[PDB]
Amino acid sequence: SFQGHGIYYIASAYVANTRLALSENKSPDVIISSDAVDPLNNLWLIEPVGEADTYTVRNAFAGSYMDLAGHAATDGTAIIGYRPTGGDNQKWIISQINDVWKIKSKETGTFVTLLNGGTGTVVGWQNITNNTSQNWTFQKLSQTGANVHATLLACPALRQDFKSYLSDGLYLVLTRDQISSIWQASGLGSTPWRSEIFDCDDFATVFKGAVAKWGNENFKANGFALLCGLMFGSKSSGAHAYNWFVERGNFSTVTFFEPQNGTYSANAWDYKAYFGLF
Amino acid sequence: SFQGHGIYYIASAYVANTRLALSENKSPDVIISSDAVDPLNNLWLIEPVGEADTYTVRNAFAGSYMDLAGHAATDGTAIIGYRPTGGDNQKWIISQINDVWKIKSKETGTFVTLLNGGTGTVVGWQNITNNTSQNWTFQKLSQTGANVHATLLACPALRQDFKSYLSDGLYLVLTRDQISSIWQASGLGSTPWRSEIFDCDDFATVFKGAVAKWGNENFKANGFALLCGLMFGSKSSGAHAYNWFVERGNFSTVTFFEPQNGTYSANAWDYKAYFGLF
Ligand SMILES: CC(=O)N[C@@H]1[C@@H](O)[C@H](O[C@@H]2O[C@H](CO[C@]3(C(=O)O)C[C@H](O)[C@@H](NC(C)=O)[C@H]([C@H](O)[C@H](O)CO)O3)[C@H](O)[C@H](O)[C@H]2O)[C@@H](CO)O[C@H]1O
Numbered sequence A, B: 001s002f003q004g005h006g007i008y009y010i011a012s013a014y015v016a017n018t019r020l021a022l023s024e025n026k027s028p029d030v031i032i033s034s035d036a037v038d039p040l041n042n043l044w045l046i047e048p049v050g051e052a053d054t055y056t057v058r059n060a061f062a063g064s065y066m067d068l069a070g071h072a073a074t075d076g077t078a079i080i081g082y083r084p085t086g087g088d089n090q091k092w093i094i095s096q097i098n099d100v101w102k103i104k105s106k107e108t109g110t111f112v113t114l115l116n117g118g119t120g121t122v123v124g125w126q127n128i129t130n131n132t133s134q135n136w137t138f139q140k141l142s143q144t145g146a147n148v149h150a151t152l153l154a155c156p157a158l159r160q161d162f163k164s165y166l167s168d169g170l171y172l173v174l175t176r177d178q179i180s181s182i183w184q185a186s187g188l189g190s191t192p193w194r195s196e197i198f199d200c201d202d203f204a205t206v207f208k209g210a211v212a213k214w215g216n217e218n219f220k221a222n223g224f225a226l227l228c229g230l231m232f233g234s235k236s237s238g239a240h241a242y243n244w245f246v247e248r249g250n251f252s253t254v255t256f257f258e259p260q261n262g263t264y265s266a267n268a269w270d271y272k273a274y275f276g277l278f
């Protein structure tokens, strides 16, 4: 559901399996996208500006802003991705009246509409009351710093908090497919462990840097970070370092990641953490 | 001077401005090299094994071991860099008689000798009493974790300790040329800062990973780490992240490094640290 400041999928409530993305003269249109694929330009960074229920809706990948083309109130006006103008045609009232969510232009009062919905265009239109083509669902994909710190303290495997660099950050929660892809490209899996000179902390540091670089290379938007923790843990046998993430399906679930071999666990391989950072 | 377990230059006391290195059929010889050049193969990792004052002397770069070619005690026998064998021709007694240091093959009883004051070869030889060709000075280039923790607590800019991943590590202290060389190739100097998405912590984490990678690529020996700290600090204007090191010329001197632009500060740009690690 929509929860204000955050990064989201915006999915049509009118047709299944369909969510919004930005296409790759005239500006690129906001278009429909199948949930069978996860291209980065389906991620929307929604940021509060001024008033209650008012937000900008920015494409995290392309950096451009959801914009009602030419400020037009006309039915069928294209919704496009445009450079930031501060204009009211880049501001959106996102509200529900019964758990049904609409996206309304602050400027025109027209609504983001799936028109004629692999078919369908995304346009502004006056209120429609005989179909649900103006209804949208929002899947949150981010956590705030406050959220993540609460999750760490509540996590049975940790029961403790870690310092964050940012004091009020917004974090994108990656999929395991994404984390794995970054890990496969890093070549850590083919880098042997060696005592002190390339040890567990080095794997976890290098991987944390690789996730930060991947976010930098892929997202033109700013104002959010990719969550990627570090933790140091021990047991009777000695010390170890891991990375850590939370799950999109349950943001209270911490998942530990072993950057030596690209594996995941819920329990950090029974290591008890004593230190960490994000 | 020699302080047991550590990384050293091994300089001749007989010919000024010279120290031992490895050469880049036969095995490579240990050769004399000018202190006007600083190839990584002049760095020797010296590790205690067995009896009082007895050590292996390993080339940190090549990973080979200082080896009296054949347990052969003929005068003039090559001192070479060889794979580890567990052999007593790879074990060295390092002791002083006048605060004059010598290097004696635990096995043949002969001494590492600079034969013939370009020129000059490094050989085993029986005791020499009419010249100083068997006398060496050891310049320490490493710190233990105990040393670095004591330095952090004593540093006026810090007056606090940071956690280390290793609990008893051995660290090589890099030169400014090496650091600036790793930084040049990190590409961080051409990476723009962006709010959250590639922020100060990302520069410091990526740089710390870059140092770890460069050490793994260049040092075939194990059993030591390259020192490279992270710190977070603040002043009224907000938070920042830096890397930190200690100086070769005064190991008590902490130096702060700005991985956004490759500069150094003795005082961390008056940011007051509240968090750090190495
Ligand atoms: C000739 C031979 O086979 N000698 C035997 C030694 O190899 C051996 O002792 C080991 O010697 C190692 C050094 O060995 C080589 C090498 O690979 O570097 C073998 C080469 O034949 C020789 N090259 C030449 C042209 O003579 C080379 C060496 O570098 C030169 O002699 C000097 O530049 O030595 C090393 O020291 C090992 O630790 C040592 O155990 C002994 C013991 O098996 O038997 C010898 O017959």
Ligand SMILES: CC(=O)N[C@@H]1[C@@H](O)[C@H](O[C@@H]2O[C@H](CO)[C@H](O)[C@H](O)[C@H]2O)[C@@H](CO)O[C@H]1O
Pocket: A027, A067, A068, A069, A070, A071, A082, A085, A087, A089
């Ligand atoms: C038909 C036409 O060209 N009209 C233009 C508009 O383009 C322009 O508005 C800007 O339009 C872009 C899309 O082109 C985007 O929607 C911007 O937010 C918007 O400001 C209009 C007013 O500036 O002038 C007309 O000439």
